[PDB]
Write an enzyme that holds these catalytic residues in place. Structure first.
Site, PDB file in Angstrom:
ATOM      1  N   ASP A 147      12.753 144.547  18.119  1.00 49.41           N
ATOM      2  CA  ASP A 147      12.246 145.100  18.586  1.00 49.41           C
ATOM      3  C   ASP A 147      11.438 144.060  19.600  1.00 49.41           C
ATOM      4  OD1 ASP A 147      10.476 146.769  18.965  1.00 49.41           O
ATOM      5  OD2 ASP A 147       8.276 146.235  18.663  1.00 49.41           O
ATOM      6  N   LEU A 166      -6.387 139.630  18.727  1.00 45.58           N
ATOM      7  CA  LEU A 166      -5.368 138.923  19.645  1.00 45.58           C
ATOM      8  C   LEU A 166      -4.648 139.722  20.452  1.00 45.58           C
ATOM      9  CD1 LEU A 166      -3.440 136.876  17.199  1.00 45.58           C
ATOM     10  CD2 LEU A 166      -5.475 135.923  19.418  1.00 45.58           C
TER      11      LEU A 166
HETATM   12  C1  LIG Z   1       3.551 140.991   8.713  1.00 45.19           C
HETATM   13  C2  LIG Z   1       3.865 142.495   9.313  1.00 45.19           C
HETATM   14  C3  LIG Z   1       3.303 142.987   8.166  1.00 45.19           C
HETATM   15  C4  LIG Z   1       3.262 144.228   8.289  1.00 45.19           C
HETATM   16 CL1  LIG Z   1       3.399 144.668   6.944  1.00 45.19          CL
HETATM   17  C5  LIG Z   1       3.680 145.122   9.320  1.00 45.19           C
HETATM   18  C6  LIG Z   1       4.281 143.893  10.640  1.00 45.19           C
HETATM   19  C7  LIG Z   1       4.792 142.682  10.812  1.00 45.19           C
HETATM   20  C8  LIG Z   1       4.824 142.452  11.608  1.00 45.19           C
HETATM   21  N1  LIG Z   1       3.875 142.113  12.899  1.00 45.19           N
HETATM   22  C9  LIG Z   1       3.533 140.809  13.416  1.00 45.19           C
HETATM   23  O1  LIG Z   1       4.588 139.658  13.172  1.00 45.19           O
HETATM   24  N2  LIG Z   1       2.223 140.542  14.020  1.00 45.19           N
HETATM   25  C10 LIG Z   1       2.468 139.720  15.180  1.00 45.19           C
HETATM   26  C11 LIG Z   1       2.142 138.095  14.037  1.00 45.19           C
HETATM   27  C12 LIG Z   1       1.789 137.277  15.019  1.00 45.19           C
HETATM   28  C13 LIG Z   1       1.137 137.343  16.635  1.00 45.19           C
HETATM   29  C14 LIG Z   1       1.924 138.241  16.959  1.00 45.19           C
HETATM   30  C15 LIG Z   1       2.132 139.381  16.031  1.00 45.19           C
HETATM   31  O2  LIG Z   1       2.043 140.937  17.370  1.00 45.19           O
HETATM   32  C16 LIG Z   1       2.398 141.138  18.608  1.00 45.19           C
HETATM   33  C17 LIG Z   1       0.647 141.056  18.684  1.00 45.19           C
HETATM   34  O3  LIG Z   1       0.351 141.155  20.265  1.00 45.19           O
HETATM   35  C18 LIG Z   1       0.505 140.407  20.545  1.00 45.19           C
HETATM   36  C19 LIG Z   1      -1.424 139.805  20.800  1.00 45.19           C
HETATM   37  N3  LIG Z   1      -1.431 138.305  21.174  1.00 45.19           N
HETATM   38  C20 LIG Z   1      -1.070 136.950  20.008  1.00 45.19           C
HETATM   39  C21 LIG Z   1      -1.244 135.911  20.272  1.00 45.19           C
HETATM   40  C22 LIG Z   1      -0.445 134.641  19.968  1.00 45.19           C
HETATM   41  N4  LIG Z   1      -0.611 134.799  18.448  1.00 45.19           N
HETATM   42  N5  LIG Z   1      -0.230 133.993  17.658  1.00 45.19           N
HETATM   43  C23 LIG Z   1       0.582 134.993  17.028  1.00 45.19           C
HETATM   44  C24 LIG Z   1       0.836 136.528  16.964  1.00 45.19           C
HETATM   45  C25 LIG Z   1      -0.219 136.370  18.647  1.00 45.19           C
HETATM   46  N6  LIG Z   1      -0.483 137.228  18.960  1.00 45.19           N
END
Ligand SMILES: Cc1cc(Cl)ccc1CNC(=O)Nc1ccc2cc1OCCOCCNc1ccn3ncc-2c3n1
Ligand SMILES: [Cl-]
Length: 288
Positions: free
Chosen positions: A132, A20
């Site tokens: 952030d 993604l």
């Molecule tokens: C949980 C975790 C664990 C550790 Cl150890 C460290 C940090 C984190 C926190 N990181 C996230 O929550 N990332 C994330 C989690 C989910 C998504 C996007 C996320 O980020 C942004 C990514 O760029 C956007 C990319 N396009 C899309 C399109 C659709 N969708 N649907 C969900 C997400 C998403 N991303």
């Protein structure tokens, strides 16, 4: 322990089928339910380290609000930590702006602003700070609602990030009181930092890029601290209500800076009762 299983090998339920994009802690994957074809976002991160990532899982596990991505499950199997997260099929707001090659309209910004404030008011009730906010971390459903994702990481994971020479990018959205900070003290007005970031996010959505976008990254830190709060480049193109909202939000003093609850009473957002503007934006982008 509570939210992370060691029993079910994830591969029984979930196939990693794509990427993604990139968050603050590396790749975010697309995952597909092998039986139903239902989709999730996923982290797949290669016992010390296991403990450090759990803080991040607990944030999503703790939040039950529509405008924060849901935790679907977490698994530790064969040296990998799988975090399965709500998939937002509209994608990130900055990707929508890239795809359509333009900023959001004021009505579109008003829906994003209203929903971001509701999420932030909920987060303050849990004493959770995002840390952030930016258009890249605001995701869209097809129905036209936001989800906040990519919560700012712990001290430990910022350490592992720097030791492995990974970035999280120049901090254009960072509040002036903490722009020189690697890690921030616990203080009564710590949570006010997200309100400043919300203000910058609105400008990024209006003008595609945040203020100081091309400055030397070290000069960005100085400019955020030293400069008058940023204003919209062409004030005549935006309502008095939008400009007034930005002026009260982008207060350099975190004590006097309004809370999310106080900003929900502002005329820019107090009458936003439809997500139609955003529903149509996501429909436009999905067409392209
Ligand atoms: C949980 C975790 C664990 C550790 Cl150890 C460290 C940090 C984190 C926190 N990181 C996230 O929550 N990332 C994330 C989690 C989910 C998504 C996007 C996320 O980020 C942004 C990514 O760029 C956007 C990319 N396009 C899309 C399109 C659709 N969708 N649907 C969900 C997400 C998403 N991303
Ligand atoms: Cl991430």
């Amino acid at each position: 322990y509570e939210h992370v299983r060691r029993d079910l090998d994830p591969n029984e339920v979930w196939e990693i089928v794509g990427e993604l994009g990139d968050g603050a802690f590396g790749k975010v994957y697309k995952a597909k339910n092998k039986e139903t074809g239902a989709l999730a976002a996923a982290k797949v991160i290669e016992e010390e380290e296991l403990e450090d990532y759990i803080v991040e899982i607990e944030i999503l596990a703790t939040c039950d609000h529509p405008y924060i991505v849901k935790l679907l499950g977490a698994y530790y199997h064969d040296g990998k930590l799988w975090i399965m997260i709500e998939f937002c099929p509209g994608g990130a707001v900055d990707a929508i702006m890239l795809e359509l090659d333009r900023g959001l309209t004021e009505p579109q910004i008003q829906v994003v602003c209203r929903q971001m404030l509701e999420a932030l008011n909920f987060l303050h009730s849990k004493r959770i700070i995002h840390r952030d906010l930016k258009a890249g971390n605001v995701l869209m459903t097809l129905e036209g609602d936001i989800r906040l994702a990519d919560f700012g990481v712990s001290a430990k994971n910022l350490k592992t990030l720097q030791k492995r020479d990974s970035f999280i990018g120049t901090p254009y959205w960072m509040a002036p009181e903490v722009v020189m900070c690697e890690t921030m003290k616990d203080t009564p007005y710590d949570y006010k930092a997200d309100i400043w970031s919300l203000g910058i996010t609105l400008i990024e959505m209006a003008q595609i890029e945040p203020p100081h976008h091309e400055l030397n990254p070290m000069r960005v830190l100085l400019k955020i601290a030293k400069s008058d709060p940023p204003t919209l480049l062409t004030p005549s193109k935006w309502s008095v209500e939008f400009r007034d909202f930005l002026a009260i939000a982008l207060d350099k003093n975190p004590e006097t800076r309004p809370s999310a609850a106080q900003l929900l009473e502002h005329p820019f957002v107090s009458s936003i009762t439809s997500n139609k503007a955003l529903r149509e934006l996501v429909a436009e982008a999905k067409a392209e």
